[PDB]
Amino acid sequence: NGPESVLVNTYQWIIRNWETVKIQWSQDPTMLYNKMEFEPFQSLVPKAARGQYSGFVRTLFQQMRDVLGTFDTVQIIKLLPFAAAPPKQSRMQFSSLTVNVRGMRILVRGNSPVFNYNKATKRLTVLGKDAGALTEDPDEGTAGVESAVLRGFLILGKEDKRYGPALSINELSNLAKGEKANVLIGQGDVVLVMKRKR
C-alpha cells in the first residue's frame, strides 16, 4: 500500500481499458487526460515536475497524432498518466520521468526497471509485478521513426556519421528546423534525430 501499488494499478487500469483509452486518446484527448483515474498517480509525481512533464508528454502525443505512421501503443500507455496535470510548456527535454516510490525513473525511450514491456510475451511488468498483457495492434507504426521521445524532434534511426559527433539532450535547442544531428539519447545509444519543421 502506497506508491508502488498506485503505480501498478494505474498501468493495470490503462491496459484493462485500452480500447476506450485508445479511442479517447485519438478523438478527445483532453477528456482522457482529465479522468479521475490518474489523480493517485499524479501525487507520486514530484510537485514541481508535474506541469513540465504534462506539457512534454502532451506535445509528444500530438507529434504522434501529427506524424502519420508513428503510432506506438506501449509509448502511449507508458507516458499517459504524466499527461494528467495542467501543462506547463517549456523547452526542456527529459530522458526519464520521476515518480516518488521509496525517486524512481521511468525512461522515456524503451524499458526500465520500473516499466518493462516484454515484446516476446506482450506482458507489461511494473516494479516487477504484472500489469497485464497487450494484443497485436494493426495500427502500430513500423517505420522505426519515433515521434514521442523528444519534444520537437523525430528519432530517425542509428547514428549517422555524416551529421557529426553526438550532442547531449540539453544541446539540441540551437538546431535549425529540418536539421539532423546525432544524439546521446541514453545508455550508450547514439541515434540520428531530426528537428521537426512545424
Author numbering: 540 to 641, 644 to 739
From the paper:
Viral determinants of virulence and transmissibility are still poorly understood, although lysine at position 627 of the polymerase subunit PB2 (PB2-627K) is now known to be important for avian influenza virus adaptation to mammals. Here, we report that a basic amino acid at position 591 of PB2 can compensate for the lack of PB2-627K and allows efficient replication of highly pathogenic H5N1 and pandemic H1N1 viruses in mammalian species. Our data indicated that a basic amino acid at PB2-591 can compensate for PB2-627K in mammalian adaptation; interestingly, these two residues are positioned near each other on the surface of PB2.
